[PDB]
Design an enzyme around this catalytic site. Structure first.
Site, PDB file in Angstrom:
ATOM      1  CG  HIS A   6      -1.741  -1.260   1.379  1.00  0.00           C
ATOM      2  ND1 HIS A   6      -2.698  -1.693   0.457  1.00  0.00           N
ATOM      3  CD2 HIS A   6      -1.741  -2.157   2.387  1.00  0.00           C
ATOM      4  CE1 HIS A   6      -3.261  -2.804   0.906  1.00  0.00           C
ATOM      5  NE2 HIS A   6      -2.669  -3.131   2.067  1.00  0.00           N
ATOM      6  CG  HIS A  23       2.608   5.887   5.878  1.00  0.00           C
ATOM      7  ND1 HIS A  23       2.299   5.857   7.208  1.00  0.00           N
ATOM      8  CD2 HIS A  23       1.637   6.508   5.215  1.00  0.00           C
ATOM      9  CE1 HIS A  23       1.073   6.371   7.335  1.00  0.00           C
ATOM     10  NE2 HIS A  23       0.624   6.795   6.100  1.00  0.00           N
ATOM     11  CG  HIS A  83      -0.850   8.552   1.625  1.00  0.00           C
ATOM     12  ND1 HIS A  83      -1.618   7.407   1.634  1.00  0.00           N
ATOM     13  CD2 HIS A  83      -0.513   8.782   2.919  1.00  0.00           C
ATOM     14  CE1 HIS A  83      -1.784   7.015   2.913  1.00  0.00           C
ATOM     15  NE2 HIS A  83      -1.088   7.828   3.709  1.00  0.00           N
ATOM     16  CD  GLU A 127      -4.094   9.560   2.378  1.00  0.00           C
ATOM     17  OE1 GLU A 127      -3.889   9.556   3.609  1.00  0.00           O
ATOM     18  OE2 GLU A 127      -4.693   8.642   1.750  1.00  0.00           O
ATOM     19  CG  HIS A 130       0.126  10.556   6.722  1.00  0.00           C
ATOM     20  ND1 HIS A 130      -0.834   9.847   6.043  1.00  0.00           N
ATOM     21  CD2 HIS A 130      -0.134  11.877   6.510  1.00  0.00           C
ATOM     22  CE1 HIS A 130      -1.626  10.720   5.437  1.00  0.00           C
ATOM     23  NE2 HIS A 130      -1.258  11.957   5.715  1.00  0.00           N
ATOM     24  CB  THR A 150      -6.215   8.147   5.218  1.00  0.00           C
ATOM     25  OG1 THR A 150      -4.871   7.640   5.028  1.00  0.00           O
ATOM     26  CG2 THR A 150      -6.238   9.434   6.000  1.00  0.00           C
ATOM     27  CB  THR A 151      -5.202   2.731   4.888  1.00  0.00           C
ATOM     28  OG1 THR A 151      -4.513   2.706   6.142  1.00  0.00           O
ATOM     29  CG2 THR A 151      -4.419   3.532   3.875  1.00  0.00           C
TER      30      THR A 151
HETATM   31 ZN   LIG Z   1      -1.061   7.828   5.734  1.00  0.00          ZN
END
Ligand SMILES: [Zn+2]
Length: 256
Positions: A61, A91, A93, A103, A116, A195-196
């Protein structure tokens, strides 16, 4: 079987994770005109001098840099937070194109990527307990715009060849997360969610106003990762972001 494709992406998540349509989902659009200055918010305290990084992992992911959180070594305190939140992982995105990947958005503006830094409330004793509490996590979110290289990101960029596919990990000791921060700690804050999946409503979001600049070559290297495992058909790891979710009955507060 969740992901970011047409068939398993964010519009599908609510079937396995009904909280996807909950009252405090993330991310959100930050309307800079509607966010109210809250003069009673403290300065953020980011205490990362003793941070102990362990490992970097492709989880199919994103890629996660994991920290030793067995003791109070790297912590976030102050701002909107009561008590001490320990750094466990960071991590990103990011997008297939420089015009998307974040995000959170700011007045509907999308950044190239979003960092994040994930912390958990030490009063709950472990991360798995913390994610079942409304104040269990604090995630520090930092926008990435394409411009100059971020020197403190290059050690991460350099190791991505070694974790190209899902389930690969590499030793990643002695990484200083202080090198990913912008100059200013001015922020916005609101109550939200992971958010996941599992989209748990356990996060105090702290989103810095100042983006960091990374180079086109740095974000290009993120886009060479793979969602797939080794010996599976190649799928580039791009567009691993959830779109903005309804704000509902929430106020975004500004520190500035
Ligand atoms: Zn995140």
């Amino acid at each position: 079987h969740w992901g970011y494709g047409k068939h398993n992406g964010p519009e599908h998540w609510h079937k396995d994770f009904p909280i996807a349509k909950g009252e405090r989902q993330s991310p959100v659009d930050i309307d800079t005109h509607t966010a109210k200055y809250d003069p009673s918010l403290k300065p953020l305290s980011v205490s990362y001098d003793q941070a102990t990084s362990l490992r970097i992992l492709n989880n199919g992911h994103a890629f996660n840099v994991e920290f030793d959180d067995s003791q109070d070594k790297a912590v976030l305190k102050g701002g909107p937070l009561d008590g001490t939140y320990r750094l466990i992982q960071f991590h990103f995105h990011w997008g297939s194109l420089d015009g998307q990947g974040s995000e959170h958005t700011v007045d509907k503006k999308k950044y190239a990527a979003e960092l994040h830094l994930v912390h958990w409330n030490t009063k709950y004793g472990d991360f798995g307990k913390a994610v079942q509490q409304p104040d269990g996590l604090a995630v520090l979110g930092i926008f990435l715009k394409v411009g100059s290289a971020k020197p403190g990101l290059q050690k991460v960029v350099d190791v991505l060849d070694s974790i190209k596919t899902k389930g690969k990990s590499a030793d990643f000791t002695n990484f200083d997360p202080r090198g990913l921060l912008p100059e200013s700690l001015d922020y916005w804050t609101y109550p939200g969610s992971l958010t996941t999946p599992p989209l748990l409503e356990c996060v105090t979001w702290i989103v810095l106003k100042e983006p960091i600049s990374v180079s086109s070559e740095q974000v290009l290297k993120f886009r060479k990762l793979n969602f797939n495992g080794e010996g599976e058909p190649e799928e580039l790891m791009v567009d691993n972001w959830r779109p903005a979710q309804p704000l509902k009955n929430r106020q975004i507060k500004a520190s500035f």
